[PDB]
Design an enzyme around this catalytic site. Structure first.
Site: not given
Lengths: 5, 241
Positions: B95-96
């Site tokens: 994720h980011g």
């Protein structure tokens, strides 16, 4: 669930 | 045209940081209470492994890493002797958010902190050699909208010789199909496998990835995805096979 990060 | 040397066997290491389980983030970081496990990410790790093994890299996978664990792994590779290698690749699947990727603990690692561990001063045995990072993560929470178109000794800089392949432009999401893998990594691997045997360089290949990912859509949200390379490469980069 079916889709992103 | 000048071309990076790419003849060693193995060519180099290809690190894969593959983050799946975000239970720690959900427990520990209030705003990430509902961040999901990245189901299907193994399909990307496997595609990258197939692809880069065919291209003569030595694959080094690491699953489910916190930020501190990621930095420990990168330090290990920063300190490794790459003198007999021609290239280094690092793939991050997580994720980011804008400018960052998340560890499984929900802490943030700025992308600059990742790539900067491999500058020429920090890793002299990679000086003059291509350092390639592929980042599969969102870079924010906005949907990318669609637009209608018609149907078709000498010194160099410390930060030279990098290629950063982002799955998305800043501010926007990137997609993961739990049953297939991510839009970006799956397209990247397909294009590399098809085009590296033809001798195409990586910027040409990444242009094709931009073309192919630009044709995909999310018909729930009417969303698109626009990948984005950035580079300080000084020569053509090819991965012969």
């Amino acid at each position: 669930x079916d889709x992103x990060x | 045209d000048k071309v990076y040397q790419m003849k060693s066997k193995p060519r180099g290491y290809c690190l894969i940081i593959n983050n799946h389980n975000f239970a720690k983030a959900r427990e520990k970081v209030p705003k990430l209470h509902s961040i999901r496990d990245r189901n299907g990410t193994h399909l990307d790790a496997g595609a990258l492994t197939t692809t880069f093994e065919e291209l003569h890299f030595e694959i080094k996978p690491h699953d489910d890493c916190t930020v501190e664990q990621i930095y420990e792994i990168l330090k290990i590779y920063q300190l490794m002797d790459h003198s007999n290698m021609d290239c280094f690749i690092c793939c991050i699947l997580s994720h980011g958010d804008k400018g960052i990727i998340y560890g499984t603990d929900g802490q943030e690692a700025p992308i600059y902190e990742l790539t900067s561990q491999f500058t020429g001063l920090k890793c002299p045995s990679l000086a003059g050699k291509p350092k390639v990072f592929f980042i599969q993560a969102c870079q924010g929470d906005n949907y990318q909208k669609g637009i209608p178109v018609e149907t078709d000794t000498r010194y160099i800089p410390d930060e030279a010789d990098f290629l950063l392949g982002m799955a998305t432009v800043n501010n926007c999401v990137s997609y993961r199909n739990p049953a297939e893998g991510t839009w970006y990594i799956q397209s990247l691997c397909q294009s590399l496998r098809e085009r590296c045997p033809r001798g195409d360089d990586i910027l040409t290949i990444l242009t094709e990835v931009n073309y192919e990912v630009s044709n995909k859509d999310d018909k729930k949200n009417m969303g698109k995805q626009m990948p984005q390379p950035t580079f300080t490469l000084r020569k053509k980069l090819v991965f012969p096979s």
